[PDB]
Design a protein around this ligand. Structure first.
Ligand SMILES: [Mg+2]
Ligand SMILES: [Mg+2]
Ligand SMILES: [Mg+2]
Ligand SMILES: [Mg+2]
Ligand SMILES: [Mg+2]
Ligand SMILES: [Mg+2]
Ligand SMILES: [Mg+2]
Ligand SMILES: [Mg+2]
Ligand SMILES: [Mg+2]
Ligand SMILES: [Mg+2]
Ligand SMILES: [Mg+2]
Ligand SMILES: [Mg+2]
Ligand SMILES: [Mg+2]
Ligand SMILES: [Mg+2]
Ligand SMILES: [Mg+2]
Ligand SMILES: [Mg+2]
Ligand SMILES: [Mg+2]
Lengths: 82, 86, 61, 205, 80
RNA sequence: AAAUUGAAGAGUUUGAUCAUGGCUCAGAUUGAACGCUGGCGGCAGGCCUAACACAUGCAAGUCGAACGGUAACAAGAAGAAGCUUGCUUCUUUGCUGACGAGUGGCGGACGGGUGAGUAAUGUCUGGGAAACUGCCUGAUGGAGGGGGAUAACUACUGGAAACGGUAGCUAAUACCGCAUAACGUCGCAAGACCAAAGAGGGGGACCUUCGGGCCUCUUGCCAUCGGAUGUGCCCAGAUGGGAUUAGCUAGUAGGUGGGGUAACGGCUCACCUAGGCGACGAUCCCUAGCUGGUCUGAGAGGAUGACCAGCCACACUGGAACUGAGACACGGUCCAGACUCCUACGGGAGGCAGCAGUGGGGAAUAUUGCACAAUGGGCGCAAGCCUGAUGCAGCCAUGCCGCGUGUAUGAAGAAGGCCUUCGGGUUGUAAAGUACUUUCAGCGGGGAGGAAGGGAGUAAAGUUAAUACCUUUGCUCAUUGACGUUACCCGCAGAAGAAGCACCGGCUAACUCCGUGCCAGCAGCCGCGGUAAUACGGAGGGUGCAAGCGUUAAUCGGAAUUACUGGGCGUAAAGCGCACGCAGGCGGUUUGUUAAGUCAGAUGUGAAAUCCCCGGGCUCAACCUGGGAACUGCAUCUGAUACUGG
């Protein structure tokens, strides 16, 4: 089905997971419909690690989209922080 | 033939093929009865054949093998032939 | 085809494996290729200590 | 990634002093810088436009301490940056950490400034940098580690650097031997004997 | 509001269909030359009334037999 | 605060000049190979050739909360064995954790590999209707009651094996009837038709044949209308060369009627009209996956499709069909052809252009490595299982970038070498020696981070007859790493463990001696070798690059030498021998009409990746990343007629 998950577009030992609304049948780093923010587990302080667009994430999840396990945790953390 | 799941799904595919062939043969015979009655003259026999075949084609359509569009296309064409036939 | 042997002194004869490389000789009508030295059988030039890259000569001790 | 031979053959080949020596003695009293090195240094042939452009480029490279690949990369950066290509190239060359350390006077030569940079002796903004090509931004603070602040080489270089004209774009204080980088140097601030038109034309060829 | 084209019919010797020859103006990508290019289409018009020589107006639709996916909307300048 | 920083010529025809004109060179680049050399690290790449065959190991399994059942698994739990008062046993899965085999759903159509075929049925760009869509989600209702088989097993039993047959068996969310319904189907209406499946967690009162009813919860199953995604189809513009390839097409153009797919469709048959395509290149031949992109170039253009991304096509070759929502399906099925391998000669098994690796070809391609720890995918209520995707490990200078291989010195301008006008110069501050540093490598230690969740417990709310049971919210504790000798830092001691390659007549940056003597030889062009040619080999010296240096292979600039930007035809190559004329190209002058070409604005789009501009993170760059710009194109809508056209 249509789901919002993470695609790694970093480098060796430098992960960087962009949040993309990609079909479950497609590849992890291949085809996707739209991109909603990103996440950097290596970025230190003073850097904006997450920029997920809650408005469009909710708009997509309303139409049957599924939020992944780590994506839901990141969204919860962002909502708790601000 | 190298995967147990492949073997057990091929066996089930054959066991489903035999049943699907039986059901499709029955459906085709029931439909062919309507055409035989249509080409055989009296409209009453054609109407009876259509009314007997109708509960079969729709039930098969709502049960897998055949499709509702197929059922509609059959029934509409048969009904149009029967009604317009003298 | 026909190639040209460079340097001074070679150990080539019939039934010898060589490595043809692209390059023509102006003063030789018909020759269009060379044999790159240091290959399977065409050993490097003897008693040469300059421009050894083009002739397959090992670094002297 | 650096020249490991004599430091005065290059200077005498170029024809002028490239500041590759400390300065305790005089260049003329220390070497024979009037002709090219080798058997035919006295014989002076005629150099073409390509020859003079290459000579200017080699003089700049020997003065600053960079190789052909890095110099071409710096030239490309200067070309892509808006403004005077020669001025941008000079500013990019001056922005190197070893060059600003030499300007501050923590090293007798650039080959010593970069050695100090690489030997974990320069502590910029509390972080050690070992790159001789580290670009120095405006308002950057360059300092010296504790294990190198009490060295004889740094003090000797600092007391020797008083002979040269102090740069006008650094604010190094010798009390703590730490410097702050001011507005970037300009063509008038730097030497006017470096022909950057030859440099920008040689790579354009 | 809906897209439509206009062309010249060149052949109608078929049942409920005509052959149109639309002309368009384009600029040459290489030489910048304005030349006239033709886009011939198979248009089906039920109740055949259009001859050969006049101009016709067509609209895009679904394919009908193999290659005519256009219908006639209006008949303008029917004069021979 | 910007996507603006853009253009170099030289040698060579002639006694000498001008111009034309051909060749070569300086430059940049690549999936690279060869010769020499070679230290570390970071980021990428690593069968272009044989779509040539494979030994070997692993790549698609899954759930008992679907079911009968349980021969291996733990307690022999429980009863109880001839009990040793704990050695064990015919039992026991309508007691349990759990699943060897099996039925049954999902996934196998995703993930992974290769460009053979394909010059258009493919691809890119912009639209269109005649459709399908499991898992996902919103809304409306049902979820009542029966039937007979079967896998397992059992007695056999055919056959060397692969497999298969007889009879009795039976439980399923297995299979099939019956009852019901439209906002569904068919029908102008009237009217006819359409299915379902149940499981698990508990628990008061009442029960109960003590199986389990009764109540909530969790979840699953049908019918219909919606959404998202995917798929299928059509139309318009571009998509190599050849005319020494001028006709092709009889299901072919269209129409009528019927049958068929999810629908439109000569998709196909049965009749009718002979049309359809083509000098704006039909048909035929060769080659070739397409695109975003990549390299060269100031741009215009030229070549090209490495990695990645989207699409297409193919799984030893050809043909075909079934299950399945979704295939004519890489590790699903049948047959034909070849190969390989068993056979007891009746007979049987296989397709690594999957991940590693083998044989063969080639100038040239890497380990039969670890982990599901993180991201997904598949299954499962969840724990949980698999993943040769992926995250990583090893080798290769194959590509880019960074660092180092010291340093201040140090004159008797040490010694030696080189030539030497033998007085001196070169190597050369070079070397020796002295002071200084210990990057990087080795040793001994500390050592973040990629890890988010999950289970065991405690509370409040949401339910609910009910604090039961479940979800949510939090709460502390016990927990999970292949990389990993982690990045990084600290102390050891010593300058050690680390520089080579090409060129030196002009193009082009750099000259002097010795050895042959048109011989050896160099060569990209001019051209050199007939006692010294700064041109061959050796030496000194210098020049250039640098862990790289040269050659080779390929593209472009220069080449304005295919010229749209940006050329010529009197003599260097170039006016048909002349005239008429079709298609085609252009077109005197005024006004009116329209707005096709043109212009301005707006919308959709031009995927992501990539270039450029502004910033950030690895000590810094390479590398990654956020925003902007750009994608110069197409379609639509609104206004202008000066110009071209109607
Ligand atoms: Mg090699
Ligand atoms: Mg039963
Ligand atoms: Mg026919
Ligand atoms: Mg050109
Ligand atoms: Mg094969
Ligand atoms: Mg296929
Ligand atoms: Mg392989
Ligand atoms: Mg995993
Ligand atoms: Mg001497
Ligand atoms: Mg030369
Ligand atoms: Mg000309
Ligand atoms: Mg002549
Ligand atoms: Mg002539
Ligand atoms: Mg004439
Ligand atoms: Mg930065
Ligand atoms: Mg783009
Ligand atoms: Mg007019």
């Amino acid at each position: 089905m249509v789901t919002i998950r993470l695609a790694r577009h970093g480098a060796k030992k430098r992960p960087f997971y962009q949040v993309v609304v990609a079909d479950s049948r497609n590849a992890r780093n291949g085809r996707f419909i739209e991109r909603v923010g990103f996440f950097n587990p290596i970025a230190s302080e003073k850097e904006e690690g997450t920029r997920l667009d809650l408005d469009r994430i909710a708009h997509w999840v309303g139409q049957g989209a599924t939020i992944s396990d780590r994506v839901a945790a990141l969204i919860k953390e962002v909502n708790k922080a601000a | 033939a190298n995967i147990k799941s492949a073997k057990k799904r091929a066996i089930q595919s054959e066991k489903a093929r035999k049943h699907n062939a039986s059901r499709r043969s029955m459906m085709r015979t029931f439909i062919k009865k309507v055409y035989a009655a249509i080409e055989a003259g009296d409209k009453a026999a054609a109407q009876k054949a259509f009314n007997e075949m109708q509960p079969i084609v729709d039930r098969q359509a709502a049960k897998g093998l055949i499709h509702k569009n197929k059922a509609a296309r059959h029934k509409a064409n048969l009904t149009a032939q029967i009604n317009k036939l003298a | 085809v026909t190639s040209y042997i460079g340097g001074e002194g070679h150990n080539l004869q019939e039934h010898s494996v060589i490595l043809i490389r692209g390059g023509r000789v102006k003063d030789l009508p018909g020759v269009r290729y060379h044999t790159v030295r240091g290959a399977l059988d065409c050993s490097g030039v003897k008693d040469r200590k300059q421009a050894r890259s083009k002739y397959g000569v090992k670094r002297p001790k | 990634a650096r020249y490991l031979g004599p430091k005065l053959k290059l200077s005498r080949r170029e024809g002028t002093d490239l500041f590759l020596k400390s300065g305790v003695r005089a260049i003329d009293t220390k070497c024979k810088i009037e002709q090219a090195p080798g058997q035919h240094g006295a014989r002076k042939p005629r150099l073409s436009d390509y020859g003079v452009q290459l000579r200017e480029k080699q003089k700049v490279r020997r003065i600053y301490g960079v190789l052909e690949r890095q110099f071409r990369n710096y030239y490309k950066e200067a070309a892509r940056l808006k403004g005077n290509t020669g001025e941008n190239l000079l500013a990019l060359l001056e922005g190197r950490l070893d060059n600003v350390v030499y300007r501050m006077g923590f090293g007798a030569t650039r080959a010593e400034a970069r050695q100090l940079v690489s030997h974990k002796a320069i502590m910029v903004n509390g972080r050690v940098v070992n790159i001789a090509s580290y670009q120095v931004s405006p308002n950057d603070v360059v300092s010296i580690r504790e294990k190198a602040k009490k060295q004889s080489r740094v003090k000797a270089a600092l007391e020797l650097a008083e002979q040269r004209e102090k740069p006008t774009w650094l604010e190094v204080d010798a009390g703590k031997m730490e410097g702050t980088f001011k507005r970037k140097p300009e063509r008038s601030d730097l030497s006017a004997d470096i022909n950057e038109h030859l440099i920008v034309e040689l790579y354009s060829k | 509001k809906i897209r439509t084209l206009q062309g010249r019919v060149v052949s109608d010797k078929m049942e409920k269909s005509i052959v149109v020859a639309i002309e368009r103006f384009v600029k040459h990508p290489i030489y910048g030359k304005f030349i006239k290019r033709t886009t011939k289409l198979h248009v089906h018009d039920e109740n055949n009334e259009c001859g050969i020589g006049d101009v016709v107006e067509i609209r895009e639709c679904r394919p009908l037999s193999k290659t005519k996916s256009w219908t006639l909307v209006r008949v303008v300048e029917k004069a021979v």
